[PDB]
Design a protein around this ligand. Structure first.
Ligand code: VYP
Length: 843
């Protein structure tokens, strides 16, 4: 019954569900019950047009955001038509019959199926089209070229191989749903005319010269008043008085505490932050016990205002007891109507052009005090340039309820903005729940499932910035994960991979419980993925701890011996790939598995593809399992590279990049996708500057030589511009790879935000004066055009990095690290001045 489901949920999260039942925090138990509404809404969407809607949840169409094909992709077609191969399995003997078609690139799946039926019968709608070799279906009326698989075949010049499948054969393999409910289911702040005061009672569990408590009232990372310290001494029993009146406290105000140690040398020993208002909008009052957190490396200040809000779950840590005033009644933050009343009671063409100039500045551009006052005075004209909302929100004095009431009214009527601009309002700079709610509404209105999958790692990270467990953002993400299994799969893994981090364990564990309770039979597939990953984690841990010093041959004897055990073989075969759940990982080809001699000794694993038409895609799936490397920098880099490639493709610049798959599975463990038929530059050379070009010529003889040199040039141009803008380091010949067809790509992105002679000879087709050929001038023009196209999209890139500021990545800890892109992109210069800077760097 439910005891079975709770056991399976526990195995998926890596935490027994009864641990959440034991938590007495009312916010936790209210979240567990209230999130079930989102679960029921999603389950209802899945049964609305059953069984078609159930099939589209499990197998959502993998399409691009727009049906429009860029001019250079349309040119690859034959008079706007594509040649596709439709296969039909005609049992007995499982015989494969192919029928080749030449149809319009925008033909919907049913038109393609009808043309195949016509060609077959020359010797109605109870069929569906599947991609040969993987579990990807064409279940929706999109034009064929919009499907990522088809669009990928047009570019690349490959032939689409689709399979005509009986609609009944798919629907019968979909499970029967249940999603049954679990067993676990005043005065106004503005009338308190006193300044804020908080009593610091005593600190337990605090085993140099003296100790004191450092405190501050903050809104985001910005202090609303000066910091106040207790006396150096531990019992203080002292009331701390702040230079801020209670009615001027914004809704997202937080108390940031610290226990510091003392030409005096100061150092934080522990920190803790408390929301001044709880999840029910009640101002905190009475006694409270805050368990503090250890100081994170590289703090550079006495307080941590960006850090997680709430008491440390480990109650055997420094515990600071605090007392808040009680004003005889429960104090609440005023209703929207009350705020509206106070906002009302609070009240040139050269100026319109000055607002337009400020509006075009990037998120990290400095806005002077004169400019902040200028923007705020024209706050009413600003509703006509909606892209200026983030700049106007920074101009508001958040410690003044008169300005904040007026800002709330402007936000309540603000025109919707594009998702990439609404995402800037979801970083740590904008804590206000009305600002954050506006941003989420822009995402619900305009974010496609495609763009949501693309920006999933920033949206899962910005969940950590929410003040409360139940919020608009988490409800949006969970609804999208519970209505699109491809989004849900990555949503599950992005959360699970952070369960080891205790500052987020509770939030992410509760969110994972809701997801597992409502995802349906996919939980059984997720448990197989989790079980295979645990066997690999334990195995690689035994290798890196016990058999660490033994030889590679002795380690391989142990790996084969461990992997041949029944328990291990069953766990490592017949499960979906966490890198791409559309790929089934059948039988382990142990003869092809090897312990690599690369850093941290990763495992190169090879599994058969059990698809009946595996030969039309890939017969074997090769994945690297790594233990010891933080795959988060690689994830972020590969996401940026994919975004840069789309910016170039859509602007008509055909620069082909290779953002191979890379999923973090937990604490410094992950999977990396093996790009088939690839070799490092060092391998090509060790099997002189003219060696590389010679290897490419031996592999590509004839007309296919021109294609390989062109592809090499384009891919090389994209990676020179990308590595430049991002400041990617350690670009030696073992981190740069090349494919049989000339495609160049980089690997291992351990360094970010800080052209060999062999490539120039390949680009110039063999010439000795390579830097003087016309091919080098054409390659140089590609770089300049690629550089300027990305510079036009700088606000997107600055925002995608800014959302990663609180991930804990050593390379991105502050806005000074993101400022590296402001220098390479030369955002403080003109388009002509930036191109000349880039040209000087290239020359
Ligand atoms: N973090 C990180 N990322 C990638 C690697 C790595 C090392 C060796 N080979 C590959 N390749 C094989 C060819 O396909 C592309 C992936 N990757 C290592 N560490």
């Amino acid at each position: 019954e439910e005891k079975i489901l709770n056991r399976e949920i526990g195995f998926a999260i890596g935490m027994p569900v009864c641990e959440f039942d034991m938590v007495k925090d009312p916010e936790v138990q209210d979240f567990r019950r209230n999130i079930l509404n989102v679960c029921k809404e999603a389950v209802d969407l899945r049964d609305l047009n059953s069984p078609h809607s159930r099939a589209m949840y499990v197998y959502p169409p993998n399409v691009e955001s727009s049906p429009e094909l860029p001019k250079h992709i349309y040119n690859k077609l034959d008079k706007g038509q594509i040649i596709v191969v439709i296969w039909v399995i005609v049992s007995p003997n499982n015989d494969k019959q192919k029928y080749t078609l030449k149809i319009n690139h925008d033909c919907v799946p049913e038109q393609v199926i009808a043309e195949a039926i016509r060609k077959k019968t020359r010797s109605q709608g109870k069929y569906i089209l599947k991609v040969c070799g993987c579990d990807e279906y064409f279940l929706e009326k999109y034009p064929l070229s919009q499907y990522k698989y088809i669009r990928s075949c047009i570019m690349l010049g490959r032939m689409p191989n689709l399979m005509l499948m009986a609609k009944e054969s798919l629907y019968s393999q979909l499970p029967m749903d249940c999603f049954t409910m679990p067993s676990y289911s005043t005065k106004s702040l503005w009338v308190i005319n006193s300044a804020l005061r908080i009593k610091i009672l005593c600190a337990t569990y605090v085993n140099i010269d003296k100790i004191y408590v450092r405190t501050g009232i903050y809104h985001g990372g910005e202090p609303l008043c000066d910091n106040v310290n207790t006396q150096r001494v531990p019992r203080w029993n002292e009331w701390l008085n702040y230079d801020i009146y209670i009615p001027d406290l914004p809704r997202a105000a937080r108390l940031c505490l610290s226990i510091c140690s003392v030409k005096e040398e100061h150092c934080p020993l522990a920190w803790g932050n408390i929301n001044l208002f709880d999840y029910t909008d009640t101002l905190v009052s009475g006694k409270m016990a805050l368990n503090l957190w250890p100081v994170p490396h590289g703090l550079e200040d006495l307080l941590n205002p960006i850090g997680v809000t709430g008491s440390n779950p480990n109650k055997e840590t420094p515990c600071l007891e605090l007392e808040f005033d009680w004003f005889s009644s429960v104090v609440k933050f005023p209703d929207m109507s009350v705020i509206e009343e106070h906002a009302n009671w609070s009240v040139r063409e050269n100026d319109k052009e000055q607002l337009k100039a400020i509006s075009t500045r990037d998120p990290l551009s400095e806005i002077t005090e004169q400019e902040k006052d200028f923007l705020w005075s024209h706050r009413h004209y600003c509703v006509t340039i909606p892209e200026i909302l983030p700049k106007l929100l920074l101009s508001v004095k958040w410690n003044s309820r008169d300005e904040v009431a007026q800002m709330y009214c402007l936000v309540k009527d603000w025109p919707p903005i594009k998702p990439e601009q609404a995402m800037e309002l979801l970083d740590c700079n904008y804590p206000d729940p009305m600002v954050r709610g506006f941003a989420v509404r822009c995402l619900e209105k305009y974010l496609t499932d495609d763009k949501l999958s693309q920006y999933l790692i920033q949206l899962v990270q910005v969940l950590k910035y929410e003040q409360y467990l139940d919020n608009l953002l988490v409800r949006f993400l969970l609804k999208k994960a519970l209505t699109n299994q491809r989004i849900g799969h990555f949503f599950f893994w992005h959360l699970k991979s952070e369960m080891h981090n205790k500052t987020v364990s509770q939030r992410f564990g509760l969110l994972l419980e809701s997801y597992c309770r409502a995802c349906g039979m996919y939980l059984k597939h997720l448990n197989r993925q989790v079980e295979a990953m645990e066997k690999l984690i334990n195995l690689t841990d035994i290798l890196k701890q016990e058999k660490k010093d033994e030889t590679q041959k002795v380690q391989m004897k142990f790996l084969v011996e461990q992997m041949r055990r029944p328990d291990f073989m069953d766990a490592l075969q017949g499960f979906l790939s966490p890198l791409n759940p559309a790929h089934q990982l059948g039988n382990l080809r142990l003869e092809e598995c090897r312990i690599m001699s690369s850093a941290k000794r990763p495992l190169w694993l090879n599994w058969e593809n059990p698809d009946i038409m595996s030969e039309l895609l890939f017969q074997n799936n090769e994945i690297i399992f790594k233990n010891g490397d933080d795959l988060r920098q690689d994830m972020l880099t590969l996401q940026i590279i994919r975004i840069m490639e789309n910016i170039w493709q859509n602007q008509g610049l055909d620069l082909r990049m290779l953002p191979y798959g890379c999923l973090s599975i937990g604490d410094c463990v992950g999977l990396i996708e093996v790009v088939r038929n690839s070799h490092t530059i060092m391998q090509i050379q060790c099997k002189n500057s003219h060696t590389l070009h010679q290897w490419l010529k031996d592999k590509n003889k004839g007309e296919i030589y021109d294609a390989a040199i062109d592809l090499f040039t384009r891919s090389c141009a994209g990676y020179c511009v990308a590595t430049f803008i991002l400041g990617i380091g350690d670009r030696h010949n073992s981190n740069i790879m090349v494919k049989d067809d000339g495609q160049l790509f980089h690997i291992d992105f351990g360094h970010f935000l800080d052209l060999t002679q062999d490539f120039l000879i390949v680009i110039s087709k063999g010439a000795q004066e390579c830097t003087k050929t016309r091919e080098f001038e054409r390659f140089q023009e590609m770089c300049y055009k690629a550089y300027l196209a990305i510079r036009q999209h700088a606000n997107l890139f600055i925002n995608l990095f800014s959302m990663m500021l609180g991930s804990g990545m050593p390379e991105l800890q502050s806005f000074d690290d993101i400022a590296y892109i402001r220098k390479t992109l030369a955002l403080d210069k003109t388009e002509q001045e930036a191109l000349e800077y880039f040209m000087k760097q290239m020359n």
